[PDB]
Design a protein around this ligand. Sequence first.
Ligand SMILES: O=C(O)CNC(=O)C(=O)O
Ligand SMILES: [Mg+2]
Ligand code: NI
Ligand SMILES: [Zn+2]
Length: 331
Amino acid sequence: AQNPNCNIMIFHPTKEEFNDFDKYIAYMESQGAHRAGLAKIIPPKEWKARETYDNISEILIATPLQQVASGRAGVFTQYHKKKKAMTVGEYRHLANSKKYQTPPHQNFEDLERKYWKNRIYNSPIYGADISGSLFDENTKQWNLGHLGTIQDLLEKECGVVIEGVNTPYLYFGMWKTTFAWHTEDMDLYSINYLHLGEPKTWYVVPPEHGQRLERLARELFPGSSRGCGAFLRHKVALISPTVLKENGIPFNRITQEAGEFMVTFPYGYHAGFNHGFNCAEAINFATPRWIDYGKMASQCSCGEARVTFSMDAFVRILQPERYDLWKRGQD
Ligand SMILES: O=C(O)CNC(=O)C(=O)O
Ligand SMILES: [Mg+2]
Ligand code: NI
Ligand SMILES: [Zn+2]
């Protein structure tokens, strides 16, 4: 078995290898990359997502989210308080202000220490989940707005045609903005490109060990666990690496820099934080190997997780027994 310790793998495709996205994903999996839950892909040196980022400041962040924490420094939840709209230029200036900017630090490890020590005492503002793309239409390789759609994959594998669309999302971050522990909707893959700015640190649990993380989360968030049988679908819980190590949960960590792709694999729980002002683009995707994970994906039916239009069909076709109750949650 390839990559039996489930280490995060880093790939350096050539420009020729960068042509066929599906083929490269399948290659990475042939080498065991999925066992980690997460892989990094460094694009060939010839490639670019677009010519410059000089003209992005007038993008609107219609609903910036203030991420307010509750709990202890290594075990907390976050809720999102909606703020008034602002442009990307306004948000950048905010991120760089004395109240929100990255503190002085020695290196990524020192910054990571400061994040876990101090995150809960601040409420950074995240421009998350903004439909759109920063890839130039002329970028033909690994263009996250031109990928094969999940509905087309389901149709090719299973023969059933379904409604729904699959488009990318932009994320504008600042120091301490945080993504809570989660897998993707329907335990899909994700791909994330860091277009510009400061790094993003990731933590990930190997898919084969995801249930160990779930069991710890039920112990650490006991009221949330009684409320919902899949409360990590709410995307609000944080657990630090120190706490994970204390409880024997297998995980790995890596820092993504501008110009790099990350791929998350089906049922790879991940969480992380931004180092400073940045912009990422991400989308879900599927492969033939996903289908069996999609059929088994947990679901939130308490009603909190409330998700896209296109997830309906995935539940309806892959999880017909659950359908009924899940749609009661969504309505
Ligand atoms: O970058 C972020 O805030 C969150 N991204 C992801 O969870 C992803 O790409 O799967
Ligand atoms: Mg603009
Ligand atoms: Ni994700
Ligand atoms: Zn729920």
